[PDB]
Symmetry: C3
Subunit: 336 residues, 3 copies
């Protein structure tokens, strides 16, 4: 397309919503290619990640960890207005793995505090993709400070299985998984700092051990449990997008399965099926489609169970509906 | 199916055998759906995992690590009578990744010492699947104490490759891989504990390093070597089922290949072919089919070679038969 | 085929070239099966792997880390003359994951300093495969000292996509990734040893932490950056072969994608497409095909960004050509 042709395309302003929820969108594209506009303000802020009051100096796109999910369709253009407030202390940028050229846009979006930039790229490949900040010289530091999220580029005709049959979800959730490296003092107590830069040296030392002190969903232990558990009902089709910008993960829905799982996150790669636990490598996003058949609580976890239950990588789904005794039944309940 | 229809189905009681062997079964299903009955007694027992005499207080389904492989066909029902003897000290349960509902059955099988329970579930999806204990609040501790195994749900028509060609194995082995986290004293020597609970706190500290002290097959360093090496013959077709309930692994058969590998362990997901080294994420089972072509010793290992040779993840196959010089030949033997 | 037939096949000697470059070859086979001959001399030598003068006693096939890429076609025979000079101190051998029998040839090629051997094997399976030294009892030490490389067994008809369409590259690079475990003294300074054997104990202790001190491409931090960045032009089709003999990796081309990626490295397994970040398990090689669409610098990294930017696993591609504003454009450059 020429610059003139692009200029004539309709524009649509999207309002982003906080993970794990996803902004309003349509699975099958409504109309021809459009320039979908998004705006995100970067917020450097303290976040408490566990019940011991442990703090991380988050570098958050749109104020959240992970950053919000942006949804467009293949061959639409995604136009992001990225803002770095003067209240922030560091330069930041954005690299969209879905984009082609200039380090995913990273080389064209370096903005110092007090600056903004507008990047436009053509979403030529369908799938879920990670996006993350990557300032030359301080790349992993920003990413493990939570400056990452993902986008979904739906096929114009919506999702399909490996045989071309349509797959239409009733609900969609975005689970961003984050590995944190929090410095400790000589007594094993996590350290606190009053400036992001003050923690750099100490954090790099923990990062080099390749051993996170915490692995969490939606920015903190318990963020997607209790009252913030994701919900669904028996019979509902749910798409669960999961990303990890720096480290491998292996999602599992206990009591359920990944009926269709685009493990590589790319829709032109046929989905694996009947999955018990899938694998998403660091630096990628993946997506699993499941139709709930049983009511009750489901644990959604990174299946290295130490990471899930000792380090924080566990979420819950609360499902309503009727119990199916054909699928499962307690013939004899626990008894002497 | 209705309760009455299920009650009318034939029942078949199966006697389990210890890994790496698999109880007798038919690859192609005989007759229509059946309620296949299994019984397992949980044993908290001390086991030795290396030649130095290192001890682990194992939590073992059927007394072994891994727990035994249960084999059924798609749409059969698996009915497990699980027993927790009064000689044990902890509550245990079972989560079948092959099952649908109540955390794989975990929420319906919590039994204290002195109790038993019978769980029945419909094996709706074909493939190999992990099963493991998961008591709320002490999940990884039970799993990395060895309380896990796998089941195989065969398609009713047996196995086939990705294009519909039948694949019939001559023998099958189940290799359970276990990551252990054994506390050490100030001399770097592994510690021993009078009772299992005594080791909890020290063990959790090692678990948090995400660095196992031992990674073994069939419960101990060298368990599948020597008189206990697996065996085959040139021309023989072998299916190797491999599981890891908590941590990633990358199986490799040195001198051979994975002719067909259901890396995700799910039979409706076409198998990868001609594999050198495959990958099974923690929380899953995988299966590889190979037709041996050369006699001699083979090393079957987790291909992070430090985990294989320093930590214990190495097994052997002894293969009888005639050497094939077309496939490989020493043109000049080691010489000056 | 018959005994006479094999003996009558043409024998062709090929001159190797050091990574990341690849020796002369044709994508589509030229003529019928041939016995392709290679010779490699093993060199034990001290190499510097970072900007601080850190040394490693490398064990290098053909004097390089990784060893060179050997290219043959399916059903050709690869006949390697492996030489271990009297100036070396250790016994070495070679295990080709592409080969069938005797631990990949390892059991037939054990050569002490002052000896040579010639191994021939039929390359029956198409794909990229790891080869590595594996002396019984000291396997990981040799592999993590850099004694590994890869070969590519191209289909006789060249590469094809999942639908059977030809994929012809304009150039190919081989990126060998190496995890090193260098001992440090109590002050955190890397240690130096007079002979390879002197470092054995200290090195195995670091290996057991499963935490590399360095993760590098082509043998050193920054070996594939700056004046040694790989190159391409917009419109050029590039195949990037990547191997890791001991540990997992997750390659990503920043600003680009893996248009077709044989993640398992095996050509009869259909390639995944539109990949952002692919996964290659330790003990395997993978291959990615990409057609460059934008000029500029690209970062090619292991996407655990700590491993890439703190440990050394980052390379660059320098691409010439015309910028495509349809694909990406700065609508508003960074500004107040
Ligand atoms: O779902 N926990 O294995
Ligand atoms: O099987 N050792 O590469
Ligand atoms: O390519 N760095 O995310
Ligand atoms: Cu940033
Ligand atoms: Cu990236
Ligand atoms: Cu238990
Ligand atoms: Cu589980
Ligand atoms: Cu060697
Ligand atoms: Cu190997």
């Amino acid at each position: 397309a020429t610059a003139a042709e692009i200029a004539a395309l309709p524009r649509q302003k999207v309002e982003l919503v906080d993970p794990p929820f996803v902004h309003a969108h349509s699975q099958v594209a409504e109309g021809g290619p459009k320039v979908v506009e998004f705006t995100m303000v970067i917020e450097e802020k303290k976040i408490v990640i566990d019940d011991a009051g442990t703090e991380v100096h988050a570098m958050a796109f749109n104020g959240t960890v992970p950053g919000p999910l942006m949804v467009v369709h293949q061959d639409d253009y995604l136009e992001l207005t990225l803002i770095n407030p003067e209240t922030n202390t560091l330069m930041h940028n954005i690299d969209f793995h879905a984009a082609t050229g200039a380090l995913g846009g990273g080389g064209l979006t370096e903005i110092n505090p007090g600056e903004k930039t507008i990047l436009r790229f053509k979403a030529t490949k369908p799938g879920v993709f990670v996006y993350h900040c990557a300032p030359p010289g301080m790349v992993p530091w920003h990413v493990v400070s939570g400056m990452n999220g993902a986008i979904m580029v739906l096929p114009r005709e919506g999702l399909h299985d490996g045989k071309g049959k349509a797959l239409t979800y009733d609900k969609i959730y975005y689970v961003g998984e984050q590995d944190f490296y929090v410095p400790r003092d000589e007594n094993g107590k996590y350290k606190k700092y009053e400036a992001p830069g003050d923690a750099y040296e100490d954090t790099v030392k923990v990062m080099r051990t390749l051993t996170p002190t915490h692995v969490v969903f939606n920015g903190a232990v318990g963020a997607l449990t209790g009252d913030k558990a994701m919900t669904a009902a028996v019979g509902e089709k749910v798409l669960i997008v999961h990303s990890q910008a720096n480290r491998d993960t292996r999602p599992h829905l206990a009591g359920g399965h990944g009926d269709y799982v685009w493990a590589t996150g790319k829709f032109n790669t046929p989905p694996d099926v009947d999955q018990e636990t899938w694998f998403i490598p660091g630096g990628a996003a993946g997506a699993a489609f499941y139709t709930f058949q049983q009511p009750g609580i489901y644990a959604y976890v990174n299946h290295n169970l130490i990471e899930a239950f000792e380090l924080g990588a566990a979420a819950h789904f609360k499902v309503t509906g009727e119990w199916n005794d054909d699928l499962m039944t307690s013939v004899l309940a626990p008894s002497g």
